[PDB]
């Protein structure tokens, strides 16, 4: 398994450039220059490359220092032929968000954050990018009374519907994308899991070009099921962009590779974005991004081991995964468990809520202890899963 | 504080009525008739009283019995004044829902649960319920490979539209409230949090009339914002009843009285329900339902004592809650942070994305470094609100 | 892959005949009678079968049931050739036991607890086990008021040193096991994790025949690391048995197949059994235990395919972590990382504390930023752990 | 509620030093010199300080540098009264301790750490401290196969040793107090909880001087309930000190003021430390040392108020818990409920395993189910202690 760009791998410029300064200690890499991770991504495989406006230029950077960055930038995309697929905005690192970007308790951050976001916006649409990531990382509170909680979401659809009318109104070929996060770094950040994100978007004025930016170890550190929370986004036609890690727990973000959080977990996730679903319906056709962190005890080798690692991990999963559902013994497994049945309506062609009501066999002469002695052997259907899984069949 | 009517405390029949039985034993009471349930719940200043099909009626009743059975319970209901504003239907504890009710893999249980739950419908309205709540606690899986993700959401729409236009057509004056679990009885659950929830009901064809009845114990589970997540509900317009317990931490399903569990998030809940919103906005006018079980280790003295418990608990958090907003340090504190200032819309009247973009004031030329010395305060905020809950101030 | 009795495979009696009823709903299965099960186990490849008093014996069965009961049990052993390797005792079940059985707050109840835990060794005794697991279950409390800390740590002492006194006394071939469980059935139980298990040890009269029973969802429960956790009782010589199933996350205790829950940990821990440590050091060689529960959508096909499935994933995951060890890259790998390098010890033969502040080349001269600079390569070898895992190597 | 140095308010110089940078984002206060945190801690009514050799010393400091900083220091310690109890390492924040200290794979990094180690203990006891606090941060992993994990205790051990035989050799008056974590910054910690930290200690030559440094919020990490953590340090007699702060929830460590986490839980903390065990025991003597962030959102005046909420926070919460115990309607509630019943030995003056099992009272004649009947009213009580909490009896 070699990973080619039609895999659409895409990898943010943050992920390989981390420098390893964490809560408890500083960094333990050297700073890595844009242009050599664009001709090292490009070089593994890589089909494009995201980032944040901060990540390329500084936050103080002059005119002539970002088109002087820009320049070098853009040449380096040249040579290599590597997309940007993904602009984001950085709405948390330097002072001024400490109380978030578009729901700071402070009105004049609120248009700072906000002017940043547009401005960023005007960057995508040059770059080509198909898809803006929205991350309120400070959005939130660490104690209750801090917040008046219906302003902060009112506020929160200002921002994200201004940002929504700019790119219709220029007409910029953009959608904008929720990235939902539990917490860290706020105690308790708002929209916290796909679902919230999902809600929040059909109360928007654009909702129409707004969907979502699931991320496995956010809803795994709300104990969540990524592969069930991401089903529910893609049933919404609402999965405009993923990304893919490990987390090993409800604890800090580890941002491990994907596949060296929960595997098994991994394993259904490359199903649904591979195969999407047993008896039809939606798929997810957009770029497969890694948003990770190469561990700080390993030098610049692990880093580049790292990002290959992503792609490796993702194309035996996907093997497997194509395995397990192509064989018969699992195609009649799953038939025995009901998961076509599944599939088929409740209700007859044109039966009411009456006719069913009134229907003696579907509930007054209905065998309730004889419908419970079905065996509907889960247990088996899984364990021919882990079998392809551990590349057993 | 003594509750009375006007307070709206309602209890569910099988609350009070919980024997004892966990996973690891049996029952440790004796069962409770729901006649006495009445009579008791009512001296105590319960305003109404809440049930599940089951809860009340055997699964094997004869037509006979069932019509017994409500000839006392509403003899009884009369006796006393209690009210019935809630009804709901057991989609879980017999064999047959092993698998669920409406998402069950198995065709045939599909329609034993929807034809279980319109004849449901039929009671709720006899008995004046405004509302009838819908926990699908068995629809989810233990293994990923169970069930087709998109159709599982296919046919829980199914049940719940059937449902929804079945009370449109007989005009029922009821709305449907569905209540998210992440996991336990199922691994996981479909409709974790709050936020699926919502974010289902907005692709449903009668929408209009479901909501939601988040459980404090539920979103605790998955380690959310209880008050968070009913804020959302709230701002959304789909807080259609609420049910109050206690939770200590992510683990098995406590239901403790409420105030037992997060105390200090207690403390906000009721501030949001009695107090609603700093800045103004929506408020919550229904029941206030404690969904809890009183510990097993307690005899029926505990029983009375745990129902008496709720209702003190809700009482005291209240009068703390009435005094800490009405105190003069605390709106200073909240003006301090900036609780109003969020409020204001980041936006000028009639001002544009452009206005804003082209505004130097707010981005070229803004003070990024002097916009963030701003101290917000949120600690000192903090401690008058602990203060305050701590009966000191 | 085929167990045989040389694996050593041993089931408790309520692994299998678990009936399904959990907290929301009945029994979905029939009970399991003893000497079928006996049977089944027997041509599966079990080794062994392990019981609690009363899966065996009712708690009210009369004198002439207990000796038909034993005569029916000791019979299938003889035919089957099946072990006995541990016995335990309920003291969760009976309603008399929900304040705990050597904690319960009630004296008498405390000395019935002790009464049915020495009656149970002398069975035990007899049964020829080597094991006699406790597992305090209802040790507890969900309210912090409940108990008196030290005096419960007093009783639990008070009673596992009586019953290891009386088995010296009696000179039996049987040491205790300990079972450390950090939530459910109570709010919250004594001795919750590994550490505080053999911390406890350690203040006991008799705690040379007294070690740890772990079992891997309850360390997962916690949110901690079965496989450190494990390392540590081994370490400590005090791994007299282990629990084995699986857990996917911090919730209700799932009981699922050994190997359906965290793959990976389950993966790390067969190496840990089979390879010991990378340096040497004790090794675990008792029975490999399944605690599990055959999910309650499953019939008895399931129930057999779920027992099956167990040894199967243990099977599986022991070949590659035999083949992962073997590898001479994986050996390179752990090199190139220090795992042998931890091994060496610190200090220099007969070096001291004081040698070694004075020795400059150690501290005064030592260059901190180029030792920095190794890359231990951790990500690498964890990828070649997965890969191995995957059996794509 | 004045605090006054007789309290034992102690606080570390990190914890108000603590200038607001985390993994998302830059400081957003100066940094404080160390003559004005003492200066302001000694107007607030702290007794002591504590601090971490490069808190104070800066790592690459020359001998000049080293001698003008410590003049500094204690001058202002003269000149205020302020008291240094216990003094730390850190063996965290420089990049050579990204695989540990004393557990790094580099053993030339395990020899500086002990070497760093080894000096601070001097510097320990120069500033007359009483407690020397290892808290090893660095010391685990985030993959299961870069480490030995006997290697692993062994190299913690050498370590722990080496310090604690030093410190005899000496003949310095300072314990030491190992400070148990469960995650982050690694993955997986080595000794997570306080029982994992107690096991290890008895395995120790030089056990009989090192005890524990058990922290609210790393128990709370693992969702485990610190009171009952104490209590089994307590119990075995190696409460040496403690870190007081608040956690919400299981995620990232929040360090918040001490009560603006779990309130009840920190209530039941002020109780058990204040009160001592029902039945009498051990009780903490040493100093209550609050190890918490001022939050980032905060400039200086919020830095010392939430120094003061700190201190503030625990005087009411012990005003309370004396209130608690000495009410005689608590001290019936108790009685009722078996607390001073738990005290009593389960056996008779001379009563042996023989004796008790032989005694047909105790078993054989034993009435279950009478016993059972006995309400332990465990809900009033606790009802009782929130009601004294929330300042309303
Ligand atoms: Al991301
Ligand atoms: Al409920
Ligand atoms: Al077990
Ligand atoms: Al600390």
Same mark, same amino acid.
């Given at each position: 398994?070699?990973?080619? $760009?039609?895999?659409?791998? @895409?990898? !943010?410029?943050? &992920?390989?450039?981390?420098?390893?300064?964490?809560?408890?200690?500083?960094?333990?890499?050297?700073?890595?220059?844009?242009?050599?991770?664009? +001709?090292?991504?490009?070089?593994?495989?890589?089909?494009?490359? =995201?980032?944040?406006?901060?990540?390329?230029? $500084?936050?103080?950077?002059?005119?002539?220092?970002?088109?002087?960055?820009? !320049?070098?930038?853009?040449?380096?995309?040249?040579?290599?032929?590597?997309?940007? $697929?993904?602009?984001? =905005?950085?709405?948390?690192?330097?002072?001024?968000?400490?109380?978030?970007?578009? @729901?700071?308790?402070?009105?004049?951050?609120?248009?700072?954050?906000?002017?940043?976001?547009? +401005?960023?916006?005007?960057?995508?649409?040059?770059?080509?990018?198909?898809?803006?990531?929205?991350?309120?990382?400070?959005? /939130?509170?660490?104690?209750? /009374? *801090?917040?008046?909680?219906?302003?902060?979401?009112?506020?929160?659809?200002?921002?994200?519907?201004?940002?929504?009318?700019?790119?219709?109104?220029?007409?910029?070929?953009?959608?904008?994308?929720? %990235?939902?996060?539990?917490?860290?770094?706020?105690?308790?950040?708002?929209?916290?899991? #796909?679902?919230?994100?999902?809600?929040?978007?059909?109360?928007?004025? +654009? /909702?129409?070009? #707004?969907?979502?930016?699931?991320?496995?170890?956010?809803?795994?550190?709300?104990?969540?099921?990524?592969? +069930? /929370?991401?089903?529910?986004?893609?049933?919404?036609?609402?999965?405009?962009?993923?990304?893919?890690?490990?987390?090993?727990?409800?604890?800090?973000?580890?941002?491990? #590779?994907?596949?060296?959080?929960?595997?098994?977990?991994?394993?259904?996730?490359?199903?649904?974005?591979?195969?999407?679903?047993?008896?039809?319906?939606?798929?997810? &056709?957009?770029?497969?991004?890694?948003?990770?962190? $190469? *561990?700080? &005890?390993?030098?610049?080798?692990?880093?580049?081991?790292?990002?290959?690692?992503?792609?490796?991990?993702?194309?035996?999963?996907?093997?497997?995964?194509?395995?397990?559902?192509?064989?018969?013994?699992?195609?009649?497994?799953?038939?025995? *468990?009901?998961?076509?049945?599944?599939?088929?309506? @409740?209700?007859?062609? !044109?039966?009411?809520?009456?006719?069913?009501?009134?229907?003696?066999? *579907?509930?007054?002469?209905?065998?309730? %202890?004889?419908?419970?002695?079905?065996?509907?052997?889960?247990?088996?259907?899984?364990?021919?899963?882990?079998?392809?899984?551990?590349?057993?069949?």
């Amino acid at each position: 398994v070699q990973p080619t $760009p039609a895999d659409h791998f @895409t990898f !943010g410029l943050w &992920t390989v450039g981390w420098t390893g300064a964490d809560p408890f200690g500083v960094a333990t890499r050297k700073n890595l220059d844009p242009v050599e991770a664009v +001709h090292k991504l490009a070089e593994l495989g890589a089909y494009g490359i =995201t980032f944040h406006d901060n990540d390329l230029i $500084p936050f103080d950077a002059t005119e002539a220092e970002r088109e002087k960055i820009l !320049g070098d930038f853009n040449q380096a995309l040249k040579d290599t032929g590597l997309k940007v $697929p993904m602009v984001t =905005t950085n709405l948390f690192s330097h002072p001024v968000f400490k109380d978030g970007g578009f @729901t700071s308790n402070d009105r004049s951050i609120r248009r700072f954050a906000l002017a940043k976001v547009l +401005h960023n916006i005007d960057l995508a649409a040059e770059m080509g990018a198909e898809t803006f990531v929205m991350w309120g990382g400070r959005e /939130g509170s660490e104690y209750d /009374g *801090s917040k008046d909680l219906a302003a902060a979401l009112d506020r929160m659809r200002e921002g994200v519907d201004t940002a929504a009318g700019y790119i219709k109104d220029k007409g910029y070929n953009l959608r904008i994308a929720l %990235e939902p996060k539990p917490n860290e770094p706020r105690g308790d950040i708002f929209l916290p899991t #796909v679902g919230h994100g999902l809600a929040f978007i059909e109360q928007l004025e +654009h /909702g129409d070009i #707004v969907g979502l930016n699931p991320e496995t170890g956010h809803e795994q550190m709300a104990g969540l099921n990524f592969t +069930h /929370g991401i089903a529910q986004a893609l049933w919404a036609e609402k999965l405009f962009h993923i990304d893919l890690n490990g987390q090993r727990g409800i604890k800090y973000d580890q941002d491990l #590779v994907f596949g060296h959080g929960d595997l098994t977990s991994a394993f259904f996730t490359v199903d649904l974005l591979e195969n999407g679903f047993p008896n039809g319906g939606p798929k997810y &056709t957009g770029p497969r991004h890694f948003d990770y962190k $190469p *561990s700080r &005890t390993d030098g610049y080798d692990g880093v580049w081991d790292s990002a290959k690692a992503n792609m490796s991990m993702y194309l035996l999963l996907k093997e497997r995964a194509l395995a397990f559902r192509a064989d018969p013994e699992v195609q009649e497994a799953m038939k025995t *468990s009901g998961v076509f049945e599944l599939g088929e309506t @409740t209700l007859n062609a !044109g039966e009411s809520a009456a006719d069913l009501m009134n229907d003696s066999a *579907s509930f007054a002469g209905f065998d309730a %202890e004889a419908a419970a002695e079905r065996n509907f052997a889960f247990i088996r259907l899984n364990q021919l899963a882990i079998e392809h899984l551990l590349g057993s069949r």
